[PDB]
């Protein structure tokens, strides 16, 4: 059984604005999800010190990224703390934060879509260069589900059916045609190395099966 | 009443570098401050969009800048998740270990001690313009403390009996002689336009006299 939502009116607003505004410095999309990973894993980690059983569902904390040129396709996978079904629908898609119109009014006050990150919204830039994205997710508290969406004002939940993660969240792009640099390798190192935070995890880089 | 603690050996470490490497781009601590606030309202506002109820010890997601020229201290609160006990004693030290020890590394290989809070510790640049810091914090699950420290490799907990905060975290800094320049209206406004100009939560500078 899958799930149909409309985006909140400021999220679908938000959204328009990133697939539409002409803005050529698009590969902060990974930095950005790799902040999110970097927060998720912190939150597991962190629960982890006072309840070390809540790493049982694995106690790896890391980040892979995978191309798939067959596919067409950038993963990005953590093991961090993972959303229950209640966070993946809150957290990402019906509810408005503060810091989507305070993000959007900023930018009317002279700044950079590349700051999206201090508004705390700054997944959404995955649609700087994806035409769909899927989100797998696994939290200990439930079950592991499937968020989608290719824009357009809706997203759809599910229960995933695919291989179980353990624990944690992988973020799928669907890649636009022209822009398949994403998924050469020589690329993806140059942005990651240009990452300004220190990541506290390994990040290890997959090499495709040509 | 008062309870002392030693620091990580390695934080300790991180907290001499800072008071005694000769460095005058001093006001990046602000900068670092701004930072923490905002990633603690970044917390409990993610977490009461889920659960509602964590904003009822209070709604307003702010930051405050508070001079004091008479007490020589300034001032930065916040109202974001807050921290409990064992927060200020242990488990925040924990997971910066990696980025302190990561940090003073990065140092040796001649990075810049600006660089201090893309390592996660920028907390401790306020030790650039502070003989002592005094931290209040309050969490929605424990009771308000007053953690404390003017380095020399040590700091206190206490139960905190002054102002009750509600939630949120309050940084005092008591400023070096040398240092007053912080509590001017002009300097903190240029500062907060040159390196915090777009945070996602309001600030609000307090005036004096
Ligand atoms: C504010 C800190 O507290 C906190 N608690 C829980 C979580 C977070 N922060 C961050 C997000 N998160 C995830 O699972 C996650 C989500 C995304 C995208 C948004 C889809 C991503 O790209 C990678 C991820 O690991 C869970
Ligand atoms: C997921 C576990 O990691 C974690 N959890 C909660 C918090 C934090 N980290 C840091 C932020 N925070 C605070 O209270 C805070 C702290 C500081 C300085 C460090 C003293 C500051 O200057 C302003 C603040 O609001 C809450």
């Known amino acids: 059984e899958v799930e149909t939502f409309a985006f909140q009116a400021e999220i679908a607003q938000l959204m ?16 950005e999800l790799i902040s999110n990973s970097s927060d998720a894993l912190d939150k597991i980690r962190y629960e982890s010190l006072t309840d070390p059983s809540k790493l049982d569902s694995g106690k ?34 019906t509810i408005a934060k503060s810091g989507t119109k305070a993000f959007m009014e900023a930018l009317q006050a002279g700044v950079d879509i590349s700051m999206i990150g201090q508004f705390g919204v700054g997944f959404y ?8 994205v899927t989100v797998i997710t696994k939290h200990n508290d439930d079950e592991q589900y499937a968020w989608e969406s290719s824009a ?11 291989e ?7 973020v799928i792009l669907h890649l636009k045609e ?5 998924l050469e ?6 942005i990651v190395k240009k990452h300004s935070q220190f ?8 090499v495709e099966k040509k």
């Open 16 to 31: 328009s604005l990133i697939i539409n505004t002409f803005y050529s410095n698009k590969e902060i999309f990974l930095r």
């Open 60 to 93: 790896e904390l890391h980040i892979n990224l995978i191309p798939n040129k067959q596919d067409r396709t950038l993963t990005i996978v953590d093991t961090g703390i993972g959303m229950t079904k209640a966070d993946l629908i809150n957290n990402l898609g």
């Open 125 to 132: 830039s995955a649609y700087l260069v994806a035409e769909k």
């Open 152 to 162: 357009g004002g809706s997203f759809t939940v599910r229960t995933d059916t695919g």
């Open 164 to 170: 179980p993660m353990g624990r944690g969240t992988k």
């Open 178 to 182: 022209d822009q398949t640099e994403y």
């Open 185 to 190: 390798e020589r690329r993806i190192k140059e």
């Open 199 to 206: 990541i506290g995890y390994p990040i290890t880089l997959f």
